[model samples]
Target: KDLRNIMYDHLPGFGTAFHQLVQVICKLGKDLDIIHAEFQASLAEGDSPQCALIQITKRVPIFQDAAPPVIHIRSRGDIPRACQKSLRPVPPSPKIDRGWVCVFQLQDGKTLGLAI
Candidate 1:
């Protein structure tokens, strides 16, 4: 998006490359404490974190498929059934009922659901 590109341009050493993705991730983690506090404040005025989760889901330009697990981890809210309804596009399964789950393959040929 234009906003990401603009803000990325201001970073000290971010270049137009995959490193830009890495930099954005690092910046997000660095700013996590502040982001969580801001989210908490908005949560205080709502029904539950689910409302906020809905806001997260709303960011998707298309209402199909699941969000990348990294972004899922960044969502610091505890949304429930109603929010789960919004997650339908993610394709729920019996083993996981509430949110998007990721199967991560490891170097040892093992996999795990990073999100649950």
Candidate 2:
């Protein structure tokens, strides 16, 4: 009887049902098309709302990584991301985007790498 209520109704992009499927995907670490398919199947079973809602874990930090402040738009002359001096603020989003730019720092603190 676990519950992690999401107020997707207040979210900006897509819709609640879409995020419902997405959050579950994060929990399961599966690709969206697969989760997307299961979500459609779950759509027919309102009585099984428990199962559907049950898997969508509460919102938590996905993982530890360096979230660069800026949206680094790449150009032909642009340097590799690590060397790209582009720590700029972004127009943000609870609203997850289609892909990710995951980076991490080692214990040295000055060093970083991309796991994506």
What local lDDT score does residue 41 receive in model 1, on the 0 to 100 scale? 56
C-alpha lDDT values of all predictions: 0.34, 0.32
**Model 1, runs deviating above 4 Å:** 1-45, 67-98
Q: For model 1, what is the alpha-carbon lDDT of residue 73?
A: 29
Q: Estimate each model's TM-score.
A: 0.29, 0.23
Residue-level lDDT of model 1, residues 1-116, one tens digit each, is 34344334433442222223323323433433333443355567763443433333333232133333322221313322222223323333312223333333334443333332
Overall local distance difference test of candidate 1 = 0.34
lDDT per residue (tens digit) for residues 3-91 in model 2:
12232332344423333343433444431234334434565655244344333222223322213222233332332433334222222
Residue 79 accuracy (lDDT) in model 2: 26
